[PDB]
Design an enzyme around this catalytic site. Structure first.
Site, PDB file in Angstrom:
ATOM      1  N   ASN B 101       0.814  -1.209   0.000  1.00 26.43           N
ATOM      2  CA  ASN B 101       0.000   0.000   0.000  1.00 26.43           C
ATOM      3  C   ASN B 101       0.850   1.262   0.000  1.00 26.43           C
ATOM      4  OD1 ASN B 101      -2.770   0.716  -0.135  1.00 26.43           O
ATOM      5  ND2 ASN B 101      -2.688   1.480   1.971  1.00 26.43           N
ATOM      6  N   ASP B 200      -2.628   1.114  -5.242  1.00 25.10           N
ATOM      7  CA  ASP B 200      -3.117   0.135  -4.274  1.00 25.10           C
ATOM      8  C   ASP B 200      -3.663  -1.079  -5.023  1.00 25.10           C
ATOM      9  OD1 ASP B 200      -3.941  -1.136  -1.973  1.00 25.10           O
ATOM     10  OD2 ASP B 200      -5.782   0.037  -1.783  1.00 25.10           O
ATOM     11  N   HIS B 356     -11.363  -0.962  -9.241  1.00 27.92           N
ATOM     12  CA  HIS B 356     -10.078  -1.515  -9.639  1.00 27.92           C
ATOM     13  C   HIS B 356     -10.286  -2.647 -10.634  1.00 27.92           C
ATOM     14  CE1 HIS B 356      -6.512   0.141  -7.601  1.00 27.92           C
ATOM     15  NE2 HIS B 356      -7.349   0.528  -6.657  1.00 27.92           N
ATOM     16  N   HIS B 390      -6.795   5.539 -10.573  1.00 28.43           N
ATOM     17  CA  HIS B 390      -5.362   5.865 -10.594  1.00 28.43           C
ATOM     18  C   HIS B 390      -4.619   5.205 -11.757  1.00 28.43           C
ATOM     19  CE1 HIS B 390      -6.613   5.210  -6.195  1.00 28.43           C
ATOM     20  NE2 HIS B 390      -6.956   6.443  -6.519  1.00 28.43           N
ATOM     21  N   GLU B 415       1.620   7.687  -9.425  1.00 31.22           N
ATOM     22  CA  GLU B 415       1.475   7.506  -7.982  1.00 31.22           C
ATOM     23  C   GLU B 415       2.859   7.347  -7.376  1.00 31.22           C
ATOM     24  OE1 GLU B 415      -1.985   5.938  -6.840  1.00 31.22           O
ATOM     25  OE2 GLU B 415      -1.453   5.276  -4.815  1.00 31.22           O
ATOM     26  N   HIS B 417       3.451   7.282  -3.796  1.00 38.25           N
ATOM     27  CA  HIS B 417       3.120   7.198  -2.376  1.00 38.25           C
ATOM     28  C   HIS B 417       4.342   6.838  -1.538  1.00 38.25           C
ATOM     29  CE1 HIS B 417       0.728   7.216   1.059  1.00 38.25           C
ATOM     30  NE2 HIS B 417      -0.192   6.315   0.764  1.00 38.25           N
ATOM     31  N   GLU B 460      -2.118  10.591  -4.610  1.00 37.47           N
ATOM     32  CA  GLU B 460      -1.085  10.388  -3.595  1.00 37.47           C
ATOM     33  C   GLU B 460       0.314  10.614  -4.166  1.00 37.47           C
ATOM     34  OE1 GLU B 460      -2.002   7.918  -0.406  1.00 37.47           O
ATOM     35  OE2 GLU B 460      -3.358   6.608  -1.534  1.00 37.47           O
ATOM     36  N   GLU B 536     -12.321   9.976  -2.832  1.00 37.81           N
ATOM     37  CA  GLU B 536     -12.360   8.756  -2.040  1.00 37.81           C
ATOM     38  C   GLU B 536     -13.034   9.050  -0.710  1.00 37.81           C
ATOM     39  OE1 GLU B 536      -8.662   6.709  -1.560  1.00 37.81           O
ATOM     40  OE2 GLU B 536      -8.021   7.053  -3.630  1.00 37.81           O
ATOM     41  N   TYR B 537     -14.079   8.290  -0.402  1.00 38.27           N
ATOM     42  CA  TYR B 537     -14.773   8.429   0.870  1.00 38.27           C
ATOM     43  C   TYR B 537     -15.524   7.138   1.152  1.00 38.27           C
ATOM     44  CZ  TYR B 537     -19.631   8.802  -0.680  1.00 38.27           C
ATOM     45  OH  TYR B 537     -20.884   8.535  -1.178  1.00 38.27           O
ATOM     46  N   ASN B 596       4.927  -6.724   2.718  1.00 38.65           N
ATOM     47  CA  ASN B 596       3.536  -6.747   2.295  1.00 38.65           C
ATOM     48  C   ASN B 596       2.652  -6.122   3.362  1.00 38.65           C
ATOM     49  OD1 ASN B 596       1.910  -8.745   3.993  1.00 38.65           O
ATOM     50  ND2 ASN B 596       3.487 -10.161   3.279  1.00 38.65           N
ATOM     51  N   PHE B 600      -5.720  -5.181   3.887  1.00 40.70           N
ATOM     52  CA  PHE B 600      -6.067  -3.864   3.359  1.00 40.70           C
ATOM     53  C   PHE B 600      -6.320  -3.841   1.854  1.00 40.70           C
ATOM     54  CE2 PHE B 600      -5.891  -0.415   6.418  1.00 40.70           C
ATOM     55  CZ  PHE B 600      -5.396  -1.050   7.536  1.00 40.70           C
ATOM     56  N   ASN B 603     -11.000  -4.476   0.366  1.00 40.49           N
ATOM     57  CA  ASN B 603     -12.045  -3.473   0.495  1.00 40.49           C
ATOM     58  C   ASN B 603     -12.978  -3.583  -0.698  1.00 40.49           C
ATOM     59  OD1 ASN B 603      -9.487  -2.981   1.523  1.00 40.49           O
ATOM     60  ND2 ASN B 603      -9.301  -0.988   0.514  1.00 40.49           N
TER      61      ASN B 603
END
Lengths: 1022, 1022
Positions: B101, B200, B356, B390, B415, B417, B460, B536-537, B596, B600, B603
């Site tokens: 992530n 992600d 995704h 993304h 990205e 991140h 990000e 995102e929410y 890793n 997560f 989702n």
């Protein structure tokens, strides 16, 4: 080894791929010297860590990169010569330089270059120190290599470079060996990046800039950025210094930022590494920022260039210095508010000039001496700004501009003039990286120079989305400097300052989709608020720069018209040698180039050897910082300085009656910045003698400035005072002239004096004093002049422009009109002899001009010639109305009472002052390399040459070359002096233009369009 | 040959150089099919010029690119296997997929990748037609190849590609031969561009998208751009179609742009090549623009997706068709005015969800069937928008979204991140080209799709000047689509729409330099005018999505809050096989990865096999297009549709007394777009029987839409009508219970019924009917639950987060509290037996909870349990207050009167309706792969399970797995059913959160913080 060979490198054509623009090239940064001592960095002493590789190199030339043998990688070829570096091989003779303006020098096919690519193989063998190899990183810096170049060190491939006007740095730590080190640079003349290098210059190639070697420790200061933040009154300053390192991160590393004024330390700051939190992951661990507080800082400006020395010392916690980097910081702030560009809260009035990097002898190789001489000439001729002219310049140029106080508009090396349309590469995202390489690195190079105040994306590249992206990038990275872009008409979103090219003061030129309105109307367009600063205006191509007074009146009247940049400073001429080896200047077409332009490279205000043109005096007078207004007997002096007080200037006034001085005085000047002063003159003597009283004021600097000598004049003005008309009568002529009427001649004898008129032609055939003839050719009329550079335009033999003045003149038969005699009568008066002549000029049965002359021989010896000229309305307006002759006697002095002492024209006479000037005959001819009309002096009241004296109001030019010879000849070195002396006295003269060199730029007020003209001349023997 | 070898290619590490991102790659364009017939292009028939190379390929795997033998260039190795294309080799078993992530899967060192670079060698041998080689250009298109890849055709090097989610096109006209043709693709898992691919997801590599071959004529249609311009009422439309060709310019070439609606031709235009003048050099000679006038066009929207077919035919003057390219055009206009995003002049309310690309079985390989199923589920669950998450998606995804009417927010593959800080690469200009390659090409690919309405720079990545430059470039190229960028807090200049991540409705989280204010306060900040759409929410990680009602209430109340995107749609689980080969879903950490993250990745609102979660019902209910308001007896129905009329909807109402229906009816809906309708209900029967009257309304679509079946329900609502309280008295119990007081037990006998309380523990030890035991474990209290995914947060065994709910619970000893008996008394009444118990839970000498219970055995058989719980204020709030037991009998049906039939929680009970639901025991357990608390049903008034009946107001969950087993086990496939059935009846339950999965997201109104609680249960045998 195999991959380091030529086959592997040349298989991947990196000069034909827009994606690949650099290989193993270090990131750009402000210039570094790697000082190991703080005192050496503070005093800008030379650093032994910085080695100069300029000198004797081994050069070979090849017609194609594939023709280079591979054995060049191991050892230099025996047939290679020894040349100097920096130098261009076109100047040596390996290749012929090519000049072009619009069209590309190669076949347009992006991104492919022609197969016949000229190739230069440079080699240098040197020795390096062992201490440079034990520790630290050693890099090589090419300040500039034209087009693409491949680098080899000890037979191993290092990197590839593409930019021409930006430094390229390569790491040689893993390539250099102990002892002998031999490098090999392969430079290509044409590459894919040359499609972005279509500037107005000679296309030379090779290593034209310095080559240097830099040694840094294992822990370095990779970059440093300085900025200044002020308050409303500029009394408290916050200097932000952000330092980025490269290498290992250690806890004991500290950065000390020290500010020095001369020797006195002003502020200092020491902080450990670690920045503020910026994102969710934290902040930079290798950047540290320092905020230094300065109380009452000395602001930087072109008037007073106050400079501070900023030293960034990366050291340890115990105080052991690791590295030191120094720079010059000037406290200033340029900001656009209310549609006005303000420097330190004051509205700027830009007096800039376009400047091309052109050495008088070495081509594009620029040194310190020529740069300093150029800066001194600019500052002495009232220039406060300079534009980089569509490419980045020498890094020393910005330092010298900071030292001497010159505003710099830095430009990127982007130009796609030859592309059809102009944005073909500037809208394609495939070329988006390369242009960014020619922008962002430059932004990283000169962002710490206070002289640089405006960034420029490019010129003549149309308008593309890449330009908008680059504009936004520059505005985001450096919001302190406003930016501008000419492309798209200069009303696009990619610019903050409206910068058109050659936008006229009043007349509009509405081109389709890219109109050039007048600047006054451009400011008044709906929705427009940005200020207007002309990036290019007042094209000074040879005999040019007319209407400059209108431009500067518009600049001074309008608050949002903040001046402009004259185009350009220095002529682009190449020296050449004849069969005696005598040096002579040459333009495009003299080097055997078929895709070339003519003398359109030969624009500027100075010659190749920095010899000032007569237009430089006009530029100096129209850009004065002091304005004068005479009211009654007092003088109002208004300073145009924004930050300095008048402490090194005094006013010197002089009253003259027809060139004879009567009274004079010196008054010191005490004027506040943009202030007012009143000078009350004493009782001015007014004699009853006939003549005109002229009042001339000048501003003299008593002390010697860093850019001017003692006694330098910065401004001047002249006014006409009370006039006493001549009401006296000439004495009665006791002797009467005797007239003999021959069949084909009219001969008038008055003692020593004798005149002879030819009845077949109707002109004054001959004049005699004693037994010496005074005329080689008869005194005739002249309705034509030698065509100027502005009159020709873009018209050649193969391409005829119908709007050009010369084409309209030759189409109507002005240069081919044959005079036909209409009337020729003679009759004696009571005390005089009157000769009445009347001619008519015709072409193909159409009458163009009709001239009627009256000659009067008085008993006192005076010749009174009254000439009336009628000009047809439908024919094009003549460039000249007056007389022409060739005297049989040459003289060494010319003494004229009139406007001078420089070459002045009806639209360029503001700089000239009315006085008595005695000058040699050699200075009567302006040495323009392209022959044209020159040497005219307007407002002439009297002219003495040898035994001859001419009186009246006329415009005269006198030289050893006829107008037909100036028309026929195309070079000044081919001109030969003729027998006698050619004199052209004209009652009326037509303008010269100067707004542009491709369209008729002469205003209607300076055109000979009245229809009927009259002038009186008095010819006597003194 | 030598240069085509592996040594030359691998010597230049193009995967480690940010400057080099593509080699010999064709420019991006909208998708082409090269139709040679207009009718085939109009009807979107398959083109024989377009060949699909998907199928069986030869694959080899190597641990390093340098380990690949050179003989692979000539022929395939015998040890190479046969795989399918498109496919990822991590799924086959060659490499282990890695999920991460925040941190990078490799050692962070830009731009260097680790030496151990996994390498996949793909080979395909095919045959080409001779007609493809005689004329035209043949190109190969890789729709997507992960990270870098090198291409070889017949042993000759072709090109190099770097982008992963964008097509790469290479010219094979000079490489393909007649007959057998063998290609060789070398794909690298890690490259320098992987620093911009930190999304992600699971990091898989290989050719995961289609490989195609395209043949074009010698004269091509290189690009075409379509745009629509409207007036204020959207009655007249101007379609601008700009066509760019490549190749020879000929005078007879013509372009015909034809617009078709179904079969009817609407407008057409034929013009010769040549554009308008743009710059001083003219205009484009290879572009032609066409302006088509459309009268009353059918506008495109997510409600009514009206589509037109645009066919561009390049042909000759005589009508001979050369090439034809077709596209779908939708007439719509998205524009931001007055801080509001308007589509066709109406304010949009985005109901989007992050999506995704994750196949259930093939990993990242996406096909048409899964895409269509996803679109159908989105449209049936009231979603009108979808974010690309993304990276760019399949080109077929945009076409399907145009067909089905879904808004698309296209994202670039950027990205960073893992970078510290997040802008480390996004502010460096050296990475400026590569990011542009991942943006501009994507802009060139999907600018003709009406589904795409918003562009996205990335996610990000912090905030850099490169982001600003790219934003300006997109705004300049395509002003029709507003763009947005999350980076920098979403208040920067690089965005037009404020798009924060997980911004809560009311509570602020002021992070340093990147604060996340509440959306209501964010709209009210000084100087802010842009609209707010949450990128995102509502993080739905397992048992999540609480507080969605607050989010949608804030969206509907505030005009400038235009909805958001739920994160995310589909779980990212990989299927795996055990030692029986039984398939089971797995998350990060099950593939032997040391760097890793845990589950997560898991989702979403649906499972891997598109099985809907219980939170999908909440998402469907909170995004209804119809709002209902009950006033008196009438119902106000307000449509939220902006462009469509209610013509396929009917309202069905039903009145129920405690689950027993009384009256029902169907009323058709005739509602204008954003209109109002009033429905007057008939006389509602109100019986005198005790109970609560519930009114339930639903909206049913009678006809079958392209995305829904007949009888689909799109909206529903429930209200509480008049209530008749029970005032009747229970009959007098003739039989009295008999109580035996043992030393260690209290045994109550009532005929068949028997109860036994343990005096040592104070709990109900056993229940008996006849001779069958009913309790395996005593009925005790339960102040703990299985920790949800939101409760754990980012806390692991090696990293402890003190703010996580589970860490506070285990730190206070909630899971380790041992019950201590305080009081246990029993006494018989006149007709009942009363048992008074009082316990106390302690940990380390500190009392946490005190429970006092009163048991009453009535003579009719009912067990009345009244429980009072006192909770300390300083201890963390318990997640549950209620009882817990394990019944000894399993049943196949569960019949409960309460809220259902889905899994609902105190913050997620709006979707559930109050009725009588009879469901199997298998559906009582939600099959979350990560075990947690699940199956809770709130608002339960009655619960029947086997012979047991529970009455009162409580929240029950019943399953075959204990809470301790759900706590211990980490996978659903390792769970085993226990003896009997575990039942948890709780008087009070605490929220689930769902704003984010790393911070406490439960609001204070849903926390158990009152201090004193009371609940009554009635246990009887039915």
């Amino acid at each position: 080894m195999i991959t380091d060979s030529l086959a592997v490198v040349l298989q991947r054509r990196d000069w034909e791929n827009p994606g690949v623009t650099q290989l193993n090239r270090l990131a750009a940064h402000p210039p570094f010297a790697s000082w190991r001592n703080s005192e050496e960095a503070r005093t800008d002493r030379p650093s032994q860590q910085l080695r100069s590789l300029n000198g004797e190199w081994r050069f070979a030339w090849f017609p194609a990169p594939e023709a280079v043998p591979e054995s060049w990688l191991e050892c230099d070829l025996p047939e290679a010569d020894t040349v100097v570096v920096p130098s261009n091989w076109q100047m040596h003779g390996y290749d012929a330089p090519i000049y072009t303006n619009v069209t590309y020098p190669i076949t347009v096919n992006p991104p492919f270059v022609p197969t016949e690519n000229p190739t230069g193989c440079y080699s240098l063998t040197f020795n390096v120190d062992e201490s440079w190899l034990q520790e630290g990183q050693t890099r090589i810096i090419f300040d500039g290599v034209n087009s693409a170049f491949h680098l080899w060190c000890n037979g191993r491939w290092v990197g590839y470079g593409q930019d021409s006007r930006l430094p390229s740095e390569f790491d040689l730590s893993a390539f250099l060996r102990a002892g002998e080190n031999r490098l090999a640079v392969m430079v290509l003349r044409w590459s894919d990046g040359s499609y972005l290098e279509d500037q107005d210059m000679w296309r030379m190639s090779g290593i034209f800039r310095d080559v240097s070697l830099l040694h840094k420790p294992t822990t370095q200061i990779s970059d440093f950025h300085v900025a200044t933040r002020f308050n409303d009154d500029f009394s408290r300053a916050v200097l932000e210094a952000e330092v980025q390192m490269c290498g290992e991160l250690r806890d004991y590393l500290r950065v000390t930022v020290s500010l020095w004024q001369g020797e006195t330390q002003v502020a200092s700051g020491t902080a450990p590494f670690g920045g503020e939190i910026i994102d969710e992951r934290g902040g930079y661990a290798d950047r540290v920022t320092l905020r230094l507080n300065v109380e009452n800082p000395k602001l930087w400006s072109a008037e007073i260039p106050n400079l501070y020395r900023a030293v960034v010392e990366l050291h340890t916690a115990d105080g052991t210095l690791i590295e030191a980097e120094a720079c010059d910081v000037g406290f200033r702030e340029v900001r656009i508010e209310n549609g006005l560009l303000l420097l330190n809260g004051k509205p700027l009035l830009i007096r800039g000039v376009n400047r091309h990097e052109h050495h008088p002898l070495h081509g594009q190789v620029m040194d310190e001496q020529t740069m300093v001489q150029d800066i001194l000439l600019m500052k002495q001729n009232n220039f406060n700004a300079v534009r980089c002219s569509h490419y980045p310049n020498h890094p020393l140029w910005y330092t010298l501009c900071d030292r001497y106080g010159l505003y710099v508009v830095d430009e990127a090396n982007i130009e796609t003039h030859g592309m059809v349309p102009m944005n073909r590469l500037t809208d394609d995202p495939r070329w988006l990286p390369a242009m960014s390489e020619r922008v962002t690195r430059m932004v990283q190079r000169d962002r710490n120079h206070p002289s640089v105040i405006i960034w420029s994306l490019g010129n003549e590249s149309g308008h593309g989305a890449n330009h908008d992206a680059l504009y936004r990038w520059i505005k985001s990275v450096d919001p302190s400097r406003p930016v501008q872009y000419e492309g798209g008409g200069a009303d696009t979103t990619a610019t903050d300052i409206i910068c058109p090219m050659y936008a006229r003061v009043d007349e509009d030129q509405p081109f389709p989709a890219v109109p050039k309105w007048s600047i006054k109307k451009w400011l008044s367009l709906p929705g427009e608020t940005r200020p207007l600063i002309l990036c290019e205006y007042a094209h000074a191509m040879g005999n040019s720069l007319g209407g400059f007074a209108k431009y500067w009146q518009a600049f001074r009247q309008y608050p949002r018209l903040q001046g402009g940049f004259v185009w350009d400073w220095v002529d682009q001429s190449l020296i050449k040698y004849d069969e005696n080896g005598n040096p002579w200047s040459a333009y495009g077409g003299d080097f055997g180039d078929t895709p070339n332009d003519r003398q359109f490279c030969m624009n500027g205000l100075v010659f190749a050897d920095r010899t000032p043109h007569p237009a430089l005096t006009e530029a100096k007078h129209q850009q004065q910082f002091f304005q004068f207004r005479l009211s009654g007997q007092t003088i109002e002096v208004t300073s145009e300085y924004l930050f300095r007080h008048s402490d090194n200037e005094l006013l010197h006034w002089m009253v003259a009656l027809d060139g004879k001085p009567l009274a004079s005085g010196e008054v010191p000047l005490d004027v506040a910045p943009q202030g007012k002063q009143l000078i009350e003159l004493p009782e001015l003597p007014q004699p009853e003698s006939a003549g005109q009283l002229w009042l001339t004021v000048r501003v003299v600097q008593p002390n010697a400035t860093a850019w001017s000598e003692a006694g330098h004049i910065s401004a001047w003005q002249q006014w006409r005072l009370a006039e006493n008309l001549s009401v006296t009568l000439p004495a009665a002529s006791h002797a009467i002239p005797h007239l003999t009427t021959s069949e084909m001649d009219f001969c008038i004898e008055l003692g020593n004096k004798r005149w002879q008129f030819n009845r077949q032609s109707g002109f004054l055939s001959q004049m005699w004093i004693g037994d010496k003839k005074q005329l080689l050719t008869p005194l005739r009329d002249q309705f034509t002049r030698a065509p100027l550079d502005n009159d020709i335009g873009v018209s050649e033999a193969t391409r005829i422009d119908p709007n050009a003045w010369v084409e309209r003149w030759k189409a109507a038969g002005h240069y081919q009109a044959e005079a036909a005699l209409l009337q020729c009568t003679a009759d004696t008066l009571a005390d005089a002899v009157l000769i009445t002549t009347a001619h008519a000029w015709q072409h193909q049965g159409k009458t163009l001009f009709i001239s009627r002359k009256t000659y009067r021989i008085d008993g006192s010896g005076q010749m009174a010639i009254t000439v009336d000229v009628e000009v047809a309305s439908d024919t094009p307006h003549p460039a000249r109305i007056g007389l022409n002759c060739q005297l049989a006697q040459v003289a060494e002095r010319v003494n004229w009472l009139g406007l001078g002492p420089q070459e002045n024209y009806p639209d360029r006479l503001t700089a000239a002052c009315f006085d008595r000037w005695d000058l040699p005959l050699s200075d009567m001819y302006t040495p323009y390399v392209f022959p044209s009309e020159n040497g005219l002096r307007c407002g002439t009241r009297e002219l003495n040459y040898g035994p001859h004296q001419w009186r009246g109001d006329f415009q005269f030019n006198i030289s050893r070359y006829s107008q037909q010879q100036l028309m026929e000849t195309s070079h000044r070195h081919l001109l030969h002096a003729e027998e006698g002396t050619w004199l052209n006295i004209d009652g009326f003269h037509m303008g010269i233009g100067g707004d542009d060199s491709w369209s008729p730029s002469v205003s209607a007020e300076f055109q000979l369009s009245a229809g009927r003209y009259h002038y009186q001349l008095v010819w006597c023997q003194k």
